[PDB]
Amino acid sequence: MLKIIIPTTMLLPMTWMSKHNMIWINATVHSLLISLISLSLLNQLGENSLNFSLTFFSDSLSAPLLVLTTWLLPLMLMASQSHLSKETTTRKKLYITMLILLQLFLIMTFTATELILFYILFEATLVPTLIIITRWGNQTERLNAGLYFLFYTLAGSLPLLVALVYIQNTTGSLNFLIIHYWSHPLSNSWSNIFMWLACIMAFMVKMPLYGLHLWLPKAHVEAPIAGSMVLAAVLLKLGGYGMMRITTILNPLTNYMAYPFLMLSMWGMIMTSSICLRQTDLKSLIAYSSVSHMALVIVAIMIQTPWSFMGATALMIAHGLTSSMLFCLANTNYERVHSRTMILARGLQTLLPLMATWWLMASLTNLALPPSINLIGELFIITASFSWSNITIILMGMNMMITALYSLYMLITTQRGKYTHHINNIKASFTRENALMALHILPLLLLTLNPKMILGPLY
Amino acid sequence: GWVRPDLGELSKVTKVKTDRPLPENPYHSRARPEPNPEAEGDLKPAKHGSRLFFWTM
What we know:
This is part of a larger assembly, with chains A and B.
Chain A: H1 2-17, H2 24-38, E1 50-51, E2 57-58, H3 62-83, H4 89-111, H5 115-122, H6 126-135, H7 142-171, H8 176-181, H9 190-205, H10 215-219, H11 225-235, H12 238-246, H13 253-257, H14 259-276, H15 282-303, H16 306-337, H17 353-366, H18 373-388, H19 393-397, H20 399-407, H21 411-415, H22 431-446, H23 452-455
Antiparallel strand pairs in A: 1-2
Chain B: no helix or strand
């Protein structure tokens, strides 16, 4: 699988040795090239995963993530074109290195064949993002933003490490294939429930879980524009991809003690969606809506119904995209006005009509309107939950109450309505914003026509 | 009929032809512990290399 790994490793000499003017022209022109190279990984067998080597392998679950990450990397490049034009060239090369290194650690992480190799490359991603969030951030609190990020993720990461080595000494291998074939029932002993607690709370923290979610509002809001998309789009989803992987040996204790988490997600998803409708900062909305959708997929894995694993993958990519346009859009209002208050800028179609067109179709994508894979994945979660419990619908049905209650709400107060006559700052839309808008939303309608590949391994 | 021993002459170490049997176990030593299992064979490459975590070699 070094088809994709090495050219990204080499991309660091590429950007570092590139000339003064190109750099970003260089950075994109080859990151797109790597994207179609990673588009090859769409070749799955039925159920036997693509085992490329002893340490690297991929399956129907990992591959959609790989294409998401690799194709994402050009997007923050062009997204960061505006924000970081003033800075000198050397840090420009360093910033791209952080982006490439981040995507580098992502692709190996999703493709590791040994659990600890996944873990070492799991939390290896906070190191570059901590640099991105803290150094290149904009507002003052960004200092405390990074601390909240790493400490939250680490507070659960270390228990996983102690658990992982324990399984190594107990079973003899943490490799996905061996642990899957030699999967054994995790008994109900108090020792084993804490083992389950160790192997789950790590992903739950950066899931996030209701109550264990403060980092995203304190990080995504003050993260740099490029950094903000990457966190929500994919760096949310390491825990998820790990979660469906480690859940092969935690049975049957999962069906017995997932209730507190199924609780905290269900109430949290309504709670997060409701508070999402009542923030004064637009950037907090995509952050709070993100966890609301993200709280949904934790429900999927807990019931571990085949249908639940169906929508877990689809919603992951769907939301992972969905947060991307909104953060891109929410960015576009910011630097134009140097504020993230939706109240300050209202009715932008009277000034930016094309931006509004992109705004609404991303919004209705967040609405989970079929045939978009946002709904079908999200819908499969509903069906699995009903199989788990018929009553489940009402609490989550309350989530199909708040989403559109806010997901069109900023539309009618950011892109829709009248304009304040004092902001002459608002200007025409540079084609970059619409162009990246095109590569952002056009895919989601494209693979909508063909949902089986991003459906997941349960096909 | 005696001779005065010369200086150093009397201090010479001497041999005695006693007929007493040799003390087989003068210290009354018991059986001693057997040695550890010795090392033998030839050094062959370690199976699957280091075998530590994910390191294939």
